[PDB]
Every structure is written in structure tokens, then in C-alpha cells.
Ligand binder design. Structure first.
Ligand SMILES: Nc1ncnc2c1ncn2[C@@H]1O[C@H](COP(=O)(O)OC(=O)CCCC[C@@H]2SC[C@@H]3NC(=O)N[C@@H]32)[C@@H](O)[C@H]1O
Ligand SMILES: Nc1ncnc2c1ncn2[C@@H]1O[C@H](COP(=O)(O)OC(=O)CCCC[C@@H]2SC[C@@H]3NC(=O)N[C@@H]32)[C@@H](O)[C@H]1O
Ligand SMILES: [Mn+2]
Ligand SMILES: [Mn+2]
Lengths: 235, 235
């Protein structure tokens, strides 16, 4: 009845009035490639490193089951597929979303969406959380808060699935293509601070051919940040 | 992201771009009560017995999982809940549908929808087929044809599912109410013929407290017809 016309992502969709977490459901359940798990609200929304994600009604909370037939070295680029997908859909709604390494999309430096990729094997779960018409935590923003008016959620859904379908199909073909789109749409050239084992500061200049963030320290030293147990902050 | 506000029916919806039969899928896979199985297109549409149900794009093909734990005798009224439901949403779109015993709803005697309930284990699958914008078989009709314009498929979906939910919740408490609604919306007082070995004709008088069709043959003899492999024809 939805009439989706995408090739893989969205071949099926399981909608929930509410769920604990779409990622948890997708990881746990036996689902086929391309199945999309979406829910009005999550009671146990999750972010990275055991962080929790507010998921009240009005936002877009979905997860996509994937089985990327590409080399294991490319898997980390999947988080970017999500990130660019959102950016593209925000641009469709004339919202200037910008990517923040490693998994965030901001509007005027205020987070409007999160992206979390979990699992491995032959089943990757692409989790996405965009604020649309829902209330959001302090410091964050939403499509509705950006346009000054409510946005038809189902329209945002169709737009995102459509972009992700195209992005994903091309990624299976050319796994490198995504990083060009990531560069063009990521927040670079500004001072950033990296928290992992200890921490350091410098300018985030670009992402290399592995999606790793390249930081140039004041000492002229250049570090390559790989996403894992790490956090990025703007100065 | 659908924002459905149903109590039971529509708590979860599993959409497919394509499927064999939503009824069969709903029968073979464990699903929770209220789960709705819907597809843009069915490849193996199913009618009663071994009849096929055309299910091209543009129509509404869905099945709902139920386990109403009320007396066994009432179980057969499920089909009517589906038909009355279709009749209700049709009126919402200004179309007057009429229930043809036992599982059909006609619009000026042209079949616009059909209902098919299958009882698997102690789980009951209510199957519904409604023609909306799709191509229909010769002799049949669709909402698009009655209105002369395309109808937003999702709008009809929301409408039917809120209606069924309401009808169902009351069924669980007052399983006897549904019959009245059927009598008020069924095609009776007319001449019909019931086919099969033992075929006969008569006036379709009323519907039993069991949902049986009461027929008055020209002899004055009254037969109570149960829906099995009997075929109802209008003369
Ligand atoms: N609704 C919201 N909008 C903006 N920021 C939020 C937010 N809710 C929480 N936050 C903040 O963002 C941080 C989380 O950031 P992270 O970078 O680690 O994590 C993320 O940004 C990923 C979020 C992924 C959410 C989706 S919803 C569909 C799927 N099902 C799930 O359970 N999860 C995924 C938190 O620690 C908060 O400070
Ligand atoms: N699209 C259509 N519109 C009107 N009539 C149709 C039609 N497709 C087929 N027919 C005719 O209607 C007859 C079928 O009548 P019956 O009374 O037996 O059967 C019905 O009227 C029940 C149809 C139930 C359809 C739904 S779709 C969702 C679910 N998944 C399934 O696989 N099935 C259910 C056929 O013999 C055809 O002649
Ligand atoms: Mn983040
Ligand atoms: Mn029939």
C-alpha cells in the first residue's frame, strides 16, 4: 500500500506504534536484506557507547538490515551512507544539514540526526535517528524547528529510503564513491578535540581513503582518527 | 512513522512491495494480534476455495492477525467484521457498498471488495481485498472508477484500519452487535440461487443469528445456508 519503488532498502517495512529499539529488533530478528524497521517512538532508544537516544513521537526512528557484498575493509563507510542519506533528504527540504565525523548530522552546529551501525557477519544494521516534528533535547534541533513549520513525516521517510536505496546500490558497485560525498558535506577546516585514550586537539582537515578523520595538530603533527571508542568535539 | 492510533489492529504493520499472499504469510509466520500484513502486489492472490484474487498495484491487499478469545460459535462472524469495515470506509469516501452474502461487498452490484478469513491454530487471519486505483476484472469496479479520480491508497488504509479496530474491540465485548450492522448493509429481499450438489433457488430473506443465509424456496420451505463450498448467485 506504500508503493515503494526502491530496489533493496524498503523491499519490506515493519512499522511499530512503539518499540524498545529498532536496532535491537533488527539485530535480533531474522530479517531479509533491505527490510526497514520503523517506529513512532522508542522506549529504549540507543546511541553509541551505551548512550541513550531520545525518541519521542514526531521524529524518524528507523533501522535497515543490510548484507553488504563488499570487502570487510569498507564496512566503516556504511555509517557515512546513513549520514549522506540524511543530508541529501535535508537538502530536499531546503535544510542545510552538515556531517560531523563520525556519525552526526548538524544544522548550525545543532544535532538533528544520529547514525549507528551495529553488528557484523552477513548482517549489518543501519540505524538512523532524525528529529522532524518531535521535541528535542536542549542544544539539538529538528526539521520543524528549522523550517518554522511541521513537516509530513511520511514524506521525509520516502525521501530518505529513496536516497539510501540509490546510495547503497552504488556503494555495492563503487565502495569509494561515498567518501567524495562525505567530504563535500562534512564540517572541516575548524579546530576539533578528540577524546579517546587521553585526548588531543587540532584541525580536522579531511577524511582519507579509509574514512579516517585527518587531524593536524598545532605541532604540525598529523594524526589519523579511526572511529571506535572515540568522541569528537568542536572548539 | 505512520502514527496509527489503533488499540489492537495496526499496533504493527508489515509492508511488502511484493508477496505471494498476505493471508498465507500471516498463516505461516508467528505474529502478534493486531499485526497487519499488507502488500502493493500479490503474485498468488487467494479467494475462496481455489479461486484466484487479482492483486495488481494500486489496490489494497491485507490480512490481519487475530485471536479473539470469545465463544467458538461467534468465530464465523469475523468475515462480517471485515465486510462491515470495508462498507464503512467506503461511505467515508462517499461510496455506498452493499454486502453480498457471504464475503462480498458490491457497489451497484459490481464487486469492489472481498473478505477471506482462514483459521490457523487458535490464530485467525482476516484477509481483505479492496480495489482502489488498480485495474479490475471485467464486471468488477474500484473506488477510482466510482469516484472518477485516483484515491490516496494510504488514506483508505488508515480509514479501514481505524474502522476494523473499533469494530473488533466491540466484537470482543458484544459479539452479537456485528450481525445487526450486516443486516442493515446486506443485499436481501432478492431472488438468488445457491449452487453445488443440491443447488436451489429462493428469496434471500435474512441472515441467521449464526450468520447463516435464510432462504425461502418457492415451496415455502426455508433453508439455512452456511458458507462452505456454496456459491451465491443473483438471478
Ligand atoms: N533526539 C535526539 N536529538 C539530538 N541529539 C540527541 C537525541 N537524543 C539523544 N541525543 C544526544 O546524542 C547522543 C547520542 O549520540 P551518539 O553519537 O552516540 O549516537 C547517535 O547519534 C545515534 C543515534 C541513533 C538513533 C537511531 S533511532 C533508530 C535506531 N534505533 C536505536 O535504538 N538507535 C538508532 C546522546 O548521548 C545525547 O547527548
Ligand atoms: N481484484 C478483484 N476485484 C473484484 N473481483 C475479483 C478480483 N480478483 C478476482 N475477483 C473475482 O472474485 C472471485 C474470488 O471470490 P471469492 O468470493 O472466492 O473471494 C474473495 O472475495 C476474497 C478475496 C480476498 C482477497 C484478500 S487480498 C489480502 C488477502 N491475501 C490473499 O491472498 N487473499 C486475501 C474470483 O473467483 C474472481 O472471479
Ligand atoms: Mn555522535
Ligand atoms: Mn464471494
Amino acid at each position: 500500500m506504500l508503493g515503494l519503488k526502491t530496489s533493496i532498502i524498503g523491499r519490506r517495512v515493519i512499522y511499530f506504534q512503539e518499540i524498545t529499539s529498532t536496532n535491537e529488533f533488527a539485530k535480533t530478528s531474522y530479517l531479509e536484506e533491505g527490510t526497514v524497521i520503523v517506529a513512532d517512538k522508542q522506549t529504549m532508544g540507543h546511541g553509541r557507547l551505551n548512550r541513550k537516544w531520545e525518541s519521542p513521537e514526531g521524529g524518524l526512528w528507523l533501522s535497515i538490515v543490510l548484507s553488504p557484498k563488499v570487502p570487510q575493509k569498507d564496512l566503516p563507510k556504511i555509517v557515512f551512507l546513513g549520514a549522506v542519506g540524511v543530508v541529501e533528504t535535508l537538502k530536499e527540504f531546503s535544510i542545510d544539514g552538515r556531517i560531523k565525523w563520525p556519525n552526526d548530522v548538524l544544522v548550525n552546529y545543532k544535532k538533528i540526526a544520529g547514525v549507528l551501525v551495529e553488528g557484523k557477519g552477513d548482517k549489518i544494521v543501519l540505524g538512523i535517528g532524525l528529529n522532524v516534528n518531535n521535541k528535542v533535547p536542549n542544544g539539538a534541533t529538528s526539521m520543524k524547528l528549522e523550517l518554522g513549520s511541521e513537516v509530513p513525516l511520511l514524506s521525509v521517510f520516502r525521501s530518505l529510503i529513496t536516497n539510501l536505496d540509490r546510495l547503497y546500490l552504488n556503494f555495492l558497485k563503487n565502495p569509494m564513491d561515498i567518501l567524495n560525498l562525505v567530504r563535500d558535506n562534512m564540517i572541516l577546516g575548524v579546530r576539533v578535540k578528540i577524546l579517546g585514550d587521553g585526548s588531543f586537539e587540532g584541525i580536522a582537515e579531511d577524511i582519507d581513503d579509509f574514512g579516517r578523520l585527518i587531524i593536524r595538530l598545532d605541532s604540525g603533527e598529523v594524526k589519523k582518527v579511526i572511529y571506535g571508542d572515540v568522541s569528537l568535539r568542536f572548539l
